[PDB]
């Protein structure tokens, strides 16, 4: 169950309250963006050791500035409340290997 956080601090909070956190910075008008969620959901079930959340750029622009979100869709894994890995474009297979690396 991917988590949807609409607050700026809530987003940052998730990042710091866990050892490993994977969050997909994505935006509401693309087919892939929504399309990557279904696979993301599967990944959240086996990878339940890693915390999965979703944060849009429109509702929380401040979030974009926090990680300087430049290329979307962007999938970044956070370790110890910080950056660790970056994935360009939302692919089920690309994330499979990315999420698998820390989450397996």
Swiss-Prot record:
One Pfam family in the UniProt entry: Thioredoxin
Site location (Contributes to redox potential value): 31-32
PTM per Swiss-Prot/TrEMBL: The disulfide bond between Cys-30 and Cys-33 acts as a redox-active center and is reduced by thioredoxin reductase TRXR.
GO molecular-function term, one example from the UniProt record: protein-disulfide reductase activity
One GO CC term on file: cytosol
Active-site annotation: 30 (nucleophile), 33 (nucleophile)
SUPFAM superfamilies tied to this protein: Thioredoxin-like (SSF52833)
Domain of life (superkingdom): Eukaryota
Residues of the Thioredoxin domain: 2-104
UniProt keywords, alphabetically: Cytoplasm, Disulfide bond, Electron transport, Redox-active center, Transport
Phosphoprotein found in the keyword field: no
Site (Deprotonates C-terminal active site Cys): 24
InterPro entries the record matches: Thioredoxin (IPR005746), Thioredoxin-like_sf (IPR036249), Thioredoxin_CS (IPR017937), Thioredoxin_domain (IPR013766)
Cell compartment(s), UniProt: Cytoplasm
Annotated S-S bridges: 30-33
Role: Participates in various redox reactions through the reversible oxidation of its active center dithiol to a disulfide and catalyzes dithiol-disulfide exchange reactions. By modifying the redox status of targeted proteins, induces changes in their structure and activity. Reduces oxidized glutathione (GSSG), thereby acting as a backup for the glutathione redox system. Reduces nitroglutathione (GSNO), a compound involved in the transport of nitric oxide (NO). Also reduces oxidative stress by detoxifying hydrogen peroxide, tert-butyl hydroperoxide and cumene hydroperoxide.
Family of the protein in this entry: Belongs to the thioredoxin family.
Protein name per Swiss-Prot or TrEMBL: Thioredoxin 1
Upper taxonomic lineage: Eukaryota, Sar, Alveolata, Apicomplexa, Aconoidasida
């Amino acid at each position: 169950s991917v988590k949807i956080v609409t607050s700026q601090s809530e987003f940052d909070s998730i990042i710091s309250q866990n050892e490993l956190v994977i969050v997909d910075f994505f935006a509401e008008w693309c087919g892939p963006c929504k399309r990557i969620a279904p696979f993301y959901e599967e990944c959240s079930k086996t990878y339940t050791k890693m915390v999965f959340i979703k944060v849009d750029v429109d509702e929380v622009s401040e979030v974009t500035e926090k990680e300087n979100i430049t290329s979307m869709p962007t999938f970044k894994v956070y370790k110890n409340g910080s950056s660790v890995d970056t994935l360009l474009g939302a692919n089920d297979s690309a994330l499979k290997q990315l999420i698998e690396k820390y989450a397996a």
